[PDB]
Amino acid sequence: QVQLQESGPGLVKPSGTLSLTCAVSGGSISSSNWWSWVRQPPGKGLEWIGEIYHGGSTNYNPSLKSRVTISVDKSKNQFSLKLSSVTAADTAVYYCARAPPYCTSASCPDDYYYYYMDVWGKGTTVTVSGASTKGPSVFPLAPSSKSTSGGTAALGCLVKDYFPEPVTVSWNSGALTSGVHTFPAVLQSSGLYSLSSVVTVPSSSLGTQTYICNVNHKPSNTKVDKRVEPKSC
Amino acid sequence: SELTQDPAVSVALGQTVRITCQGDSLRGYYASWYQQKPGQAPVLVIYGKNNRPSGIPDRFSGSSSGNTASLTITGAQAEDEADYYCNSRDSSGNHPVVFGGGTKLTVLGQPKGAPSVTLFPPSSEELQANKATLVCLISDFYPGAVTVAWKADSSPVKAGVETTTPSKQSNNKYAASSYLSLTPEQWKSHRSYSCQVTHEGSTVEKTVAPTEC
Amino acid sequence: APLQLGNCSVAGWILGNPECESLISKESWSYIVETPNPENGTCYPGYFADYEELREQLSSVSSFERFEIFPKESSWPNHTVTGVTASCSHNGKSSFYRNLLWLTEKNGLYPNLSNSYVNNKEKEVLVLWGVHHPSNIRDQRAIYHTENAYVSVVSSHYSRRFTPEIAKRPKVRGQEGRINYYWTLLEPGDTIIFEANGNLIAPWYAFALSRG
Ligand SMILES: *[C@@H]1O[C@H](CO)[C@@H](O)[C@H](O)[C@H]1NC(C)=O
Ligand SMILES: *[C@@H]1O[C@H](CO)[C@@H](O)[C@H](O)[C@H]1NC(C)=O
Structure with a gap:
């Protein structure tokens, strides 16, 4: 079905802005889907970054909310991530993933109350260094x-x-x-x-x-x- | 809030292990489980109550009870060795996503293996670039604990040594590498260099000499 | 011999309520026996339109038969069909009406729906369907990928367009959503066309019969 592929610089200068791009194929980016980002520092656990739904709706990690911007570009069928004021803590393998839509009321089928990320990109290694x-x-x-x-x-x-x-x-x-x-x-x-x-x-x-x-x-x-x-x- | 899980657990092969994840967000939404092998992207193994994606063996089962979600692997195998993460969405506020700390699962009872050691001398191309590196490749050993020592002629050497921490290969056994950096003059002025690999109290040593092919 | 519905009602039987599962029907009957009103027959809360008239025309039939009006494996390719809900559970497992399909978005999209059926069964064909009404606007977009939804049901003797109304409601059988159930009789040779972009509880199984 849908496939994801990250792309971006593997090197970002300190205090600079990380800028990554994820290309969606086999599906429309303007769909009922929460396009998400996840990162992983070397030897560390997964950390959820944020998610976007077409229409401008964004939901970010509270600890990252100030420096994170996730957007979407329908013309190129892709969604992006931009992280500002990067330090050594931001060195990580960055993944783009797909999360299904969900409901906040008891008016949906049972399958719309599960959270998961089934479609993952291959990962892009970004190093914060001068x-x-x-x-x-x-x-x-x-x-x-x-x-x-x-x-x-x-x-x-x-x-x-x-x-x-x-x-x-x-x-x-x-x-x-x-x-x-x-x-x-x-x-x-x-x-x-x-x-x-x-x-x-x-x-x-x-x-x-x-x-x-x-x-x-x-x-x-x-x-x-x-x-x-x-x-x- | 946050999801907590124990960082490490072990299971003997063929037996069953239960990986527990706890947090205040598990009562709102259902937990999901991922398996991450070294150097690979996470793969979803369980979502919802007990639903497994297509291509996930029935050995993986997931249950929840209160503020606790558990991943059970019945009849563990060597291929099950990986990191396991729980994952859920909060049912309050703007519904942020939280990951568990992760659990490293180790499968015990696998067959032991003595390390295979291959020592490469500096290639003539690197020497003609006025550089010299000795490459000691160590592979096919279990357990994955090994200590490396180098020797110039018969004297131990510690200057210019860099050794990788062991890593499992597609064989399920471990591999590791060690580099000895030298000048072309140091390389040619000695009679031999040796890579000494010690694994479980026994030692394998390989030797290269600049005067031999 | 009368149609014996046992412990469940006419509403749950004709819709395919998972608790009235099994309960094999017959080809003919002169009257119906039933235990009425187990949660008004609908495992998912809603409004059954023209329910009194349907019971009148189902009183005496001679050539009753349950067939597949729109097969699940086709008819709805670009939509997902395996929608279930805990309010319609069977053996402690969530299910849905055996004669209807809760169509939702597949791969994030709910394309424009259009499916027709011609009554080649030489009898009257009873077609049941439904329209869903979420309780908030956020869930409407997540489920059907549209904020403005329509469902068009057109035949030679029937024509109506339903617009879902989103409103907050109390929990009826644990659900804040509603499903209104509708039906119409298709004379032999007639064509019925279902068009939708969301909120359709699509017909899966229908009924052909006489004396009704
Ligand atoms: C309802 O079900 C019970 C158990 O299956 C059975 O004993 C009873 O006879 C049923 N009702 C009727 C009217 O047969
Ligand atoms: C689907 O139908 C609606 C209403 O008839 C129309 O506005 C729309 O352009 C059609 N196509 C898509 C892709 O929604």
């Missing part, structure tokens, strides 16, 4: 005849010194998904992130199958397709 954006440097992690384990061998990609989060990695343009693990990122003393993505692969394929990792760093609009070859020694 540091600049930096694209990653990708280096291959080649397989070695010492570091193999019989019929299978491990090869990967080092994604070094990017900022901010996040980075996604696929293999062979998504055609290779089994044995793939992308580790979480380390935060170095320099304030830059780094991670690795490894895939376990049959050993007898090292010399005849091409392995390319696909690095995506949307905060810097950077895509790197790194070829991972066996060591020529």
Whole structure:
């Protein structure tokens, strides 16, 4: 049915205004629906931000009411969120969701007294910082005849010194998904992130199958397709 | 007001667990439950009285009693390990939405595994950029508690070490990584470097050498 | 043999009240026996229009039959149909009239409704329907996605447009909303057209009969 997809900057300067956009497809934004926003600081619980119903009706979190503005744009079939005077407390993964309509009287069917959010976006990582954006440097992690384990061998990609989060990695343009693990990122003393993505692969394929990792760093609009070859020694 | 729930609970696999959520807003509107796996968006598992969305197994059941809502998972499995949040709308005022604090469910009795360790030397491309990183990838271990140590030749090293906290992979086992940052001259001036991985009192060590392929 | 309604009334039986569930009818009867007024027969509070005349024409029938005038799985695609309410519960589970469908918004929308039926049954067809009246304006918009609603029922011998009136009311059977029930007789060959943008308690099952 309806699908949601967030979009916006992954970096906002302190005291600045966060500005996010959620695109609704497979449905009309001007409908009987409470389009909502939810955020999640790293390692923390879900926090409800606010909701909107077409006609201008907005309902916000009391602790966020002063800095939050949720609007809607019918022409582009989307609803937005704008959060002003951002600090480190506003660093979080922001979700846009859909809540059903509800009633405040005993004149509706039973299903209109439940609250839930069934349709969720994929999430947008926003970091509140003053540091600049930096694209990653990708280096291959080649397989070695010492570091193999019989019929299978491990090869990967080092994604070094990017900022901010996040980075996604696929293999062979998504055609290779089994044995793939992308580790979480380390935060170095320099304030830059780094991670690795490894895939376990049959050993007898090292010399005849091409392995390319696909690095995506949307905060810097950077895509790197790194070829991972066996060591020529 | 607010919804409170215990932050952590554990259940042995195959048995049943009941995740309780309490608050003054539960008498007005019905509570809803979500399951959040690490790094993923929350998925609604129960709404209304005991209604489950399409594609949610009947192992998840939800009951309420007074100012208390409960999520029961009968016959727990390894795939049920996630964070669970309650969620309701207040029946007073402008009807704001409140989330519970969340509950981390741990499924006990899963098979143990010794960590698999793969140590990568600095690639020739990174070296020719005048940088050097050793990459120690640790995977397929349960429980997810591990301690890493590095060695230059035979001497312990603590400078330039960065290790990720363990994370479960799609295998349900845990993985973790450790990086040793070096200069190309430090890399070439030693005879070998080692990544030492200790898990449940036993240790796996891998070694790389600049003179070998 | 007379129509035996047992512990429930004519209103609850003809509407499909969940407490009169089962209670299989017959093809013919010369009179009706009943226990009258269990909450006036309607599990959801409201007004039954021309109720005395309906009982008169249902007194003696010869070829009674209950059929599906508008099947649930079709007829109403862009609307949701599984609307139930606690006032019409069966076995401790909320339900609704077995012969009517509480149509509400599907995916946030309640498109313009238009469905017709032709009486090809060679007898009279009794069509029941309803119109819903929420108690506040906020719930009207949440349920039907319109502030101004109409329901048009047009046949060759019947024509009426209902406008829902929203007003606060006491709780009757725990509900502040009302549903007014209406009906008309469709002669053979006639066409009846239901048009709506909200508040319609749409006909699901109807009745064909003779001597009425
Ligand atoms: C009403 O129901 C009860 C129990 O099912 C039954 O004993 C009684 O006979 C019923 N009423 C009539 C008039 O049959
Ligand atoms: C539906 O019908 C109403 C009244 O006949 C009309 O005003 C409206 O334009 C029609 N279309 C929609 C999409 O509501």
